[PDB]
């Protein structure tokens, strides 16, 4: 499919013009150029002057752009015609021996690259604020932003695989369309020529797949072949036109995601948008989409760094567990205590075969099922002590299906010639919709076929009842444990029989995970020096035995491994003395110099070498090597955790210092209760009582997210209604807001059910902001009318209905949209608004104000229970 | 006179001494007490005796092994027995030119460097747990730890000044001892010989200044002398014994503090201990103290870097003050719109003489004073541009004495021939004791001055007519502001008469603080390139003007100043659009390569430019060349600032959430106070109001520890003494304790000076514990005392004394230790008690309890003023 370079067809929505390098004269054109640019008068032929089509300012601007160095920073370029002054978006690019210009009519906002970039600022800010560490959420966010920006029928992210076949990862459509999620596609749908072109043309748009194209009447006298690959007006393949017609998608717009893997540009995938009717999008929007795709790529680059850091942390955890297991008594200690061999490698069962005695943990086959497989391993693979398989049926076990489907994956190791230790992994499930690549290896770029595909279905692919594979480090760890156990109890090869290879001959992987280790006695003399530590330092063990660890071996001068300075010496002494009284593996930064010159930086962990008698015998230290990024991440995480835990003291002090005076307040109120007064004073005391009750209940605190346990108590509306006005009217009194006693007297004549604090929580806060924009001499209007509905068996319906005034300038739109939860940076003053809204709506109520003429009215309605 | 110390042949009588030869290992020098101490209960222990003929076989072998070792400072102390009667001994060895010197010290009846370092673990972890930032707390903690570890009569930190004289910075003494804190001493008190010798032997102990010194004998056939400087038994020079007998401090132990200032090293000071009775301290304690001094020196050197970081942070704040408000309403825009010129430098007032009008701010003399100052500058300083005067009387302008103590320090800058700006600093109060240095240069003490100084209590000196000094960058900022105003209006030196006279015409302050700025218009073309940026990047203004900022100037390839990679290109284009969209300055990390090819790392602050009509006209930004460590600190700080503010806003929401019903309760109380009530009800309501005010007073928001100040006002003690004690009697409702009136009637009857909002916070929360543990039937007694003494000049001391009985089980030892701030785990009640003790300890108030027979007794003392 190479004729893309040699094709004289363009889409019929813009004109294409070609100019030489120096004379700036027309050498090629399109059939619609004369109908569009000129009409709406010399005939547009070869060599016609550019100034005869556009006005003087437009021609001058185009000339200045043509003389510029990097033309990609200037387009789009607004121009006008001669007579009608019809505007156009000139898009200029340069090819070997020519300059090609595209013209598209305007108005079917930007004039450069930066102005065009400005249209994606909201989406970029949305992308930057995302919490880091999850690729799926990032893909969903980006696809949603693209859908909102472009206004297409559907948009989807389409990721490529190693096989070169692809799968959609996210999707956002309009209601009434068939979901495309989770469907794989053959690798031959997108030929390698297309995805090779997409490294340089990162945005492609097709307006109509059923339109009538226009040919490029190139001049015959020119000796140059005008390729059209870099232009925005290319007409696609007939094969692709039929492909798009089959899917019932007419117009399309697609963007590439090129990720710099180390550089190494790799096409991660595509962001493809479809619409069922012809659609045209102006050039600045396409440029903004391209910039957004660049930002998305530089974020998916960070996601893989996070993944690598997580894997490296897992390796470090395995090393720490191995160092733990080194000390305990072998071999039963690996299984009796915790953490045991199950935590060594991610598995589902484990078994030990020591001295014809079987120790089992987790989901393991029946004890009668272990000796025969052990004997089969012994007699079939005598030339190895380790084996791995993701399916026991493939490896040749005759009785694989007789043990059930609970366990299918094996990892076995021979510590001795008779005894064994092996892990079990449960068989996994899961199938893929559509064939991945439909299993057609080797390319088929023949450019002879017309379209060997049509329609679409589910096309499920079956599985082989397999388990997850065993990684490299998950076998290094098992080899390390084998070495430890073999040494403590008193070349070879490890099989790797995976599916579709049926056999492999990997060596034992003599790269054990055992870290550098040393250790001293209680006086300070060296006692241990590992082979790994000897490799790291270049110092033989015999050089550093019966030598003082502090000063002689590690020191600032005359020492074998010279330390940085005296602060390092002091810190090493402090750590070695602190570790005597603590067993926690205190990870401390440790940096030294090798025998030659190499600044080695690691983390050091020190523990006591306790003996059987219970008396310290020395220190056991091991040294784990981590890269700069993980060390910085650990430092930042430690600081963040300390800062987070610091505020707890302040919070507790605040709560106690608010609790004590309120307790004194109930003290003085209950003690003044003895001096009784008239009935009006009794109701005033009741109002103060539930006011302080609400105070304490606010200090008595998932309720931040709106979830409520719905605590229920029996109370009647009089005190709640009085306290709602009492808690707010001091604020309005400064603003000269009067009270009208408009509430009816029939609301209070009926008994009510519901708590006092819960009911009053979602009432008073509404009008608190009212004084903010209310001028002097305002008015307050409150009307209530309880609705008695006899719905239910034991609980009636006291449907609330309250109309509250809304005077002054009131809450503006950018403060009203905060109520519905449509904003991120919600002001702290407004939090109680949506808090009360969520509290009301948890009981299927409503609290809402609508803009009216003169003054608005807040409507409050709740399905509050009735105590009738 | 270091020569006298070198050849001293006298040692203290608490240990023996033996000097042997390098090769043969025979005694060549020995002390008189050695013969009767090492061989009690008798051969010739003269020259040539072998070392092995005095100790048992294991001890002899250990000594012989220790002699043949390169770095032997890691081995001492060495245990040694005697073959005569098995007498324990510490042997401490060192090597000098041609000899090996070993000194022996007897061991009390109750093994290396690392074991000696163990006796300081608690002190080291206490020093490490402190939060950084301040020095006084560090010095106090170090002195307290040394006092607890060594058990001496008094210890004190003694810091050296640049003059080589010193001053006492902290102190801790047993009760009954006169403090020395804050004093000063002449530089001739410590001869430079000892000061130089302290960089080798970092601990010096003297047991008895009155004992009879012993003498060592050395064979006179030697060709070289014997040096005893490094030995830990050397006898001090006689005039120092007289000096020590003057203060009646018989014994002493001093520890040098050597700070390796950036590997140059400097003696920061000493930690001097004193005792009135002869004292002896074993050798491992001296090693532990030496190690703790090393750790303290490291931490001291770590807290002088935060000072430099604060200096740099303050410098990167005067470049971000009035960068654009100057362009509108110049020069009147610097006084009217805040921040004003009073924020440029740390001053007390300002004045702006322009167009014959004064726009004074803060504290400033009358207009006639300013006119007289201006006329004096115009007359007597005709060829001056700006000056800073520490005290206006030293410069001697005629009318200095009229304003007096109101204004002393001045800083004047001259805008033009008539206008100018004044900054004013008031009189500061500062006094020293014992005199600053008692100057007597040229080493007046040499081979003389047996003891021409005797006991003296104090020596008060007063320096008059001085203000705080004007720094260098504080005048660079004024110079740069003068340059800004001179440029916007369209090489001269500045006086620095600061200390005593001899005006120093510094060269135009050769450091104008002005950051490198640039800017673009709306399309993107560069318009501004100031000389600072042109100097930083080595690029002329012409080569950049009329180009494009993105792509042509800052671009990945073929650009004037190439960027690092492509991720640094899409991050500069993002900020140039957010700056316009949001208009608020944004600070980001920047990095690039100059024309010469040097990597530059900066911070970029970018903000939007508007015209008079509020229309955005472009963008202007400037570079803040932060230092490496400052950049990393700000990076890590801003990494978690988002989470910090996210928690802060959530915490602050509850403030309003609880203030609203607090407003309701105040409303109800205020309208219930409007009814007819008896005296008892009135007193109840007054107590309720007093106990309620503390909620709002606490909710004003540091709040945990530090930055705490107590308000002061005139009040009667009856109200608080009743409200605080009444509000707790019913807290233990389930125990029914008995409370009866016990306070003295002479403490209620008087009014005084002091806030009642924190008196409840102090003496009402203390009695919460008394009901938590005491069972039913507990009796509580409160004793009050108001000592009215006139121990002052303008304030009458109405000192408050509180006594509380402690029934029940009482506070255990671990809970008690929390009150003193010496524990990591502090309970909420313990945290509140510690906070209250700190809150009362600023004005010399002691809160404690002592356990007696039956019930313990509390003592609370607070120095309080009287408003009589
Ligand atoms: C949902 C996934 C999806 C797929 C797999 C898809 C395929 C696709 N077809 C693409 C490319 C091509 N696809 C083909 C041809 C074929 N596609 C098929 O279905 C056949 C295997 C083959 C016809 C022989 C050719 C020649 C191209 C080159 C593009 C051109 O010259 O116009 C592209 C590239 C984007 C574009 O140029 O518009 C896409 C995105 N379109 C989709 O919507
Ligand atoms: C509280 C401040 C304080 C000061 C200023 C003080 C001075 C001092 N005097 C000290 C040292 C000396 N200072 C001197 C000399 C003189 N001191 C004086 O008062 C004269 C100026 C001079 C002799 C008359 C000498 C001979 C020494 C001891 C040197 C030696 O014995 O070889 C020291 C160091 C401690 C020691 O070396 O044992 C101290 C601490 N003692 C204090 O406690």
A767/chain B closest Cα distance in angstroms? 12
Helix segments in B274-343, DSSP class H: 283-302, 305-315
Q: Which residues contact B229 (CB under 8 A, 6 or more apart)?
A: B5, B6, B197, B200, B201
Q: Is-cis flag, bond preceding A743, omega within 30?
A: no
For residue A359, tell me if it sits in a domain: yes
CATH for B105: 3.30.450.20
CA distance A193 to A189: 11
The encoded tokens of residue A165 equal 């076949």
Q: Which ligand is nearest to the Cα of residue B240, counting in written order?
A: 2
If DSSP states are collapsed to H, E and C, what string results for A374-402? Answer: HHHHHHHCCCCCEEEECCHHHHCCCCCHH
My answer on whether B470 and B538 are in the same domain is no
A123/chain B closest Cα distance in angstroms? 11
My answer on whether B61 and B6 are in the same domain is yes
For residue B243, tell me if it sits in a domain: no
Instruction: Please answer whether residues B797 and B863 qualify as being in contact, where contact means their C-beta atoms are separated by less than 8 angstroms.
Output: yes
Q: Which ligand is nearest to the Cα of residue B181, counting in written order?
A: 2
A–B: how many Cβ contacts below 8 A?
222
Q: Which residues contact B494 (CB under 8 A, 6 or more apart)?
A: B384, B385, B386, B387, B388, B475, B479, B505, B506, B508, B509
Which domain-ending residue is among A108, A140, A172? A108
Do strands B386-389 and B494-495 pair parallel, antiparallel, or not at all (unpaired)? parallel
**Has B239 been labeled as part of a binding site?**
yes
How many angstroms separate the alpha carbon of residue B106 from the centre of ligand 2?
A: 28
My answer on whether A102 and A120 are in the same domain is no
Q: Is-cis flag, bond preceding A76, omega within 30?
A: yes
Q: Which ligand is nearest to the Cα of residue B2, counting in written order?
A: 2
Residue A140's Cβ-count burial label (10 Å; 0-12, 13-18, 19+) is middle
For residue B369, tell me if it sits in a domain: yes
CA distance B190 to B452: 15
Residues of A in contact with B558 (CB under 8 A): 69-70
3-state secondary structure of A352: strand
Residue having the nearest C-alpha atom to atom 27 of ligand 2: B240
Q: Within an 8 Å CB–CB cutoff, is residue A259 touching chain B?
A: no
CATH for A267: 3.30.450.40
My answer on whether A88 and A129 are in the same domain is no
Q: Within an 8 Å CB–CB cutoff, is residue B646 touching chain A?
A: no
For residue B632, tell me if it sits in a domain: no
- DSSP label at residue B326: G
Which residues 511-550 of A are in CB contact (within 8 Å) with B? 523-524, 548, 550
Residue B712's Cβ-count burial label (10 Å; 0-12, 13-18, 19+) is middle
My answer on whether B483 and B537 are in the same domain is no
For residue A452, tell me if it sits in a domain: no
CA distance B803 to B856: 10
Angle at A364 between CA A363 and CA A366, to 5 degrees: 130
B359 lines ligand 2 (CB under 6 A): no
CATH for B327: 3.30.450.270
CA distance A159 to A296: 13
My answer on whether B100 and B130 are in the same domain is no
For residue B698, tell me if it sits in a domain: no
CATH for A761: 3.30.565.10
Angle between helices A679-698 and A628-672 (to 10 degrees): 160
Query: In the Cβ-directed half-sphere of A671, how many Cα atoms lie within 13 Å?
Result: 21
Whether residue A832 and residue B656 make contact (CB cut-off 8 A), yes or no, is yes
Instruction: For residue A600, report the phi and psi dihedrals to the nearest 5 degrees.
Output: -90, 125
3-state secondary structure of A119: helix
If DSSP states are collapsed to H, E and C, what string results for B636-660? Answer: HHHHHHHHHHHHHHHHHHHHHHHHH
For residue B446, tell me if it sits in a domain: no
My answer on whether B810 and B710 are in the same domain is yes
CA distance A340 to A320: 13
CA distance A370 to B117: 56
CA distance B167 to B272: 12
CA distance A514 to A477: 8
**For residues B279, B282, B284 and B287, what is the CA-based torsion angle, rounded to 10 degrees?**
40
My answer on whether A101 and A149 are in the same domain is no
Residue with tokens 């559509």: A434
Instruction: Please answer whether residues A152 and A171 qualify as being in contact, where contact means their C-beta atoms are separated by less than 8 angstroms.
Output: no
Q: Which ligand is nearest to the Cα of residue B166, counting in written order?
A: 2
Residue of B123, B550, B583, B665 to mutate, interface with A, max A Cβ within 10 Å: B665
Radius of gyration of chain B (CA): 36
My answer on whether A39 and A127 are in the same domain is no
CA distance B836 to B850: 18
* CA distances for B837 relative to A647, B706, B720, B767, angstroms: 21, 12, 19, 14
Q: Within an 8 Å CB–CB cutoff, is residue B676 touching chain A?
A: no
Instruction: Ligand 1: list residues with CB < 6 Å.
Output: A 1, 4, 158, 185, 188-191, 194, 204, 236-237, 239-240, 243, 252, 254, 272, 449, 451, 453
Residue with tokens 């001179």: B486
* Nearest CA-CA partner of B251 in B6, B4, B14, B10: B14
Q: Gaps after which residues in chain A, C–N over 2.5 Å?
A: 40, 108, 262, 490, 701
My answer on whether A130 and A276 are in the same domain is yes
Q: Is-cis flag, bond preceding B23, omega within 30?
A: no
The encoded tokens of residue B577 equal 């659009």
Residue of B662, B668, B725, B764 to mutate, interface with A, max A Cβ within 10 Å: B668
**For residues B93, B94, B97 and B101, what is the CA-based torsion angle, rounded to 10 degrees?**
-30
CA distance B782 to B747: 12
How many angstroms separate the alpha carbon of residue B191 from the centre of ligand 2?
A: 7
Residue A414's CB is within 10 A of a number of other CB atoms, namely 22
Which residues 569-628 of B are in CB contact (within 8 Å) with A? 570, 573-574, 576-578, 580-581
* Nearest CA-CA partner of B752 in B792, B724, B712: B712
Q: Gaps after which residues in chain B, C–N over 2.5 Å?
A: 41, 110, 262, 490, 701
The encoded tokens of residue A749 equal 């004549």
Q: Largest Cα–Cα distance in chain B?
A: 111
Q: What is the tally of structural domains in chain A?
A: 5
Instruction: For residue B446, report the phi and psi dihedrals to the nearest 5 degrees.
Output: -160, 115
Instruction: Please answer whether residues A436 and A184 qualify as being in contact, where contact means their C-beta atoms are separated by less than 8 angstroms.
Output: yes
- Resolution for the entry shown, Å: 3.1
Whether residue A112 and residue B567 make contact (CB cut-off 8 A), yes or no, is no
B188 lines ligand 2 (CB under 6 A): yes
Residues of A in contact with B295 (CB under 8 A): 570, 574
The encoded tokens of residue B181 equal 């804190």
Residue range of the domain that includes B783: 705-866
For residue A638, tell me if it sits in a domain: no
The encoded tokens of residue A43 equal 């005939």
Instruction: Please answer whether residues A278 and A293 qualify as being in contact, where contact means their C-beta atoms are separated by less than 8 angstroms.
Output: no
My answer on whether B723 and B801 are in the same domain is yes
Instruction: For residue B614, report the phi and psi dihedrals to the nearest 5 degrees.
Output: 70, 25
My answer on whether A722 and A573 are in the same domain is no
User: How much of chain B is in helix, strand and coil states, percent to nearest 5?
Assistant: 35, 20, 45
Whether residue B664 and residue A727 make contact (CB cut-off 8 A), yes or no, is yes
Which domain-ending residue is among A108, A139, A158? A108
Whether residue A114 and residue B523 make contact (CB cut-off 8 A), yes or no, is yes
Q: Within an 8 Å CB–CB cutoff, is residue B686 touching chain A?
A: no
Residue A683's CB is within 10 A of a number of other CB atoms, namely 13
Which domain-ending residue is among A108, A126, A158? A108
């Amino acid at each position: 499919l190479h004729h893309i370079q040699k094709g004289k067809l363009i889409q019929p929505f813009g004109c294409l013009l070609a100019l030489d390098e120096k004379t700036f004269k027309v050498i090629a054109y399109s059939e619609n150029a004369s109908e569009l640019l000129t009409m709406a008068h010399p005939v547009l032929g070869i060599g016609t002057d550019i100034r005869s089509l556009f006005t003087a300012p437009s021609a001058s601007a185009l000339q200045k752009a043509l003389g510029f160095g990097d033309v990609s920073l200037l387009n789009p370029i607004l121009v006008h015609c001669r007579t009608s002054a019809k505007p156009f978006y000139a898009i200029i690019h340069r090819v070997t021996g020519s300059i090609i210009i595209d013209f598209e009519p305007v108005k079917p906002t930007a004039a450069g690259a930066l102005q065009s970039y400005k249209l994606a600022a909201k989406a970029i800010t949305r992308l930057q604020s995302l919490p880091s560490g999850s690729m799926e959420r990032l893909c969903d966010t980006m696809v949603q932003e693209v859908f909102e920006l472009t206004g297409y029928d559907r948009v989807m992210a389409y990721k490529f695989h190693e096989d070169d076949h692809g799968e959609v990862v996210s999707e956002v459509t309009k209601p009434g369309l068939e979901p495309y999620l989770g469907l794989h596609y053959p690798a031959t749908d997108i030929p390698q020529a297309a995805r090779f072109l997409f490294m340089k043309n990162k945005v492609r748009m097709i307006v109509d797949c059923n339109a009538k194209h226009a040919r490029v009447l190139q001049d015959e006298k020119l000796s140059f072949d005008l390729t059209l690959c870099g232009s925005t007006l290319r007409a696609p393949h007939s094969c692709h036109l039929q492909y798009m017609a089959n899917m019932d998608s007419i117009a399309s717009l697609v963007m590439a995601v090129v990720v710099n893997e180390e550089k190494r540009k790799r096409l991660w995938g595509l962001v493809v948008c479809h619409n069922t009717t012809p659609r045209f999008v102006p050039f600045p929007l396409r440029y903004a989409c391209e910039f957004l795709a660049q930002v998305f790529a530089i974020h998916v680059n960070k996601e893989v760094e996070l993944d690598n850091q997580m894997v490296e942390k897992n390796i470090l955890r395995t090393q720490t567990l191995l160092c733990d297991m080194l000390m305990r008594d072998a071999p039963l200690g690996i299984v009796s205590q915790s953490p045991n061999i199950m935590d060594l490698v991610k598995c589902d069962g484990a078994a030990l075969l020591y001295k014809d005695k079987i120790w089992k943990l987790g989901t393991t086959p029946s004890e009668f099922h272990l000796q025969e497989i052990a004997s089969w391993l012994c007699e079939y693979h005598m030339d190895s002590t380790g084996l791995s398989t993701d399916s026991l049926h493939d490896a040749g076990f005759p009785r694989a299906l007789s043990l059930g489907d609970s366990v299918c994956g094996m990892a076995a190791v021979r510590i001795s010639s008779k005894d064994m230790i092996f892990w079990f992994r449960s068989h996994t499930a899961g199938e893929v919709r559509w064939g991945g690549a439909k299993h057609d290896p080797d390319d088929r770029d023949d450019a002879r076929r017309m379209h060997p595909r049509s329609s679409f279905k589910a096309f499920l692919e079956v599985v082989k009842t397999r388990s997850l594979p065993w990684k490299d480090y998950e076998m290094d760890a098992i080899h390390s444990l084998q070495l430890i156990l073999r040494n403590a109890f008193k070349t070879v090869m490890d099989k790797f029989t995976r599916i579709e290879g049926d056999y492999k001959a990997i060596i034992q992987n003599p790269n054990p995970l055992i870290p550098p280790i040393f250790g001293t006695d209680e006086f300070g003399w060296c006692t241990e020096w590992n082979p790994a530590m000897s490799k790291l330092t270049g110092l033989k063990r015999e050089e550093v035995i019966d030598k003082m660890l502090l000063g002689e071996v590690f020191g600032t001068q005359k020492s074998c491994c010279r330390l940085k300075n005296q602060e390092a010496f002091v810190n090493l002494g402090i750590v070695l003395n602190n570790a005597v009284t603590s067993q926690d593996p205190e990870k401390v930064s440790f940096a030294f110099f090798t025998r030659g010159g190499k600044y080695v930086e690691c983390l050091l962990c020190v523990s006591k070498k306790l003996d059987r008698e219970g008396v310290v015998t020395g220190v056991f230290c091991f040294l784990q090597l981590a890269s700069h990024e993980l060390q910085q991440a650990l430092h930042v995480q430690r600081l963040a955790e300390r800062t987070a835990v610091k505020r707890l003291k302040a919070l507790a002090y605040i709560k106690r210092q608010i609790r004590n005076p309120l307790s004194g307040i109930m003290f003085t109120r209950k003690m003044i209760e003895g001096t009784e007064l008239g009935p009006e004073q009794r109701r005033i005391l009741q109002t103060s009582a539930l006011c302080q009750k609400q105070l304490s209940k606010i200090l008595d605190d998932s309720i931040i997210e709106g979830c409520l346990d719905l605590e229920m108590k029996e109370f009647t509306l009089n005190e709640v209604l009085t306290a709602s006005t009492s808690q707010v009217m001091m604020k309005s009194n400064g603003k000269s807001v009067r009270i009208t006693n408009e509430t009816g007297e029939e609301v209070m004549s009926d008994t009510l059910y519901g708590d006092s604090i819960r009911l009053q929580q979602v009432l008073a806060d509404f009008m608190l902001m009212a004084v903010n924009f209310t001028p002097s001499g305002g008015q307050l209007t409150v009307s209530a009318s309880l609705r008695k509905d006899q719905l239910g068996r034991s609980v009636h319906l006291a449907n609330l209905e309250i109309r509250l005034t809304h005077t002054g300038a009131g809450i503006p739109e950018f403060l009203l949209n905060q109520m519905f939860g449509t904003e991120e940076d919600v002001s702290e003053e407004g939090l109680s608004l949506m808090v009360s809204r969520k509290l009301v709506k948890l009981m299927n109520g409503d609290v809402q104000y609508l803009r009216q003429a003169g003054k608005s009215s807040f409507i409050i309605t709740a399905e509050l229970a009735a105590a009738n």
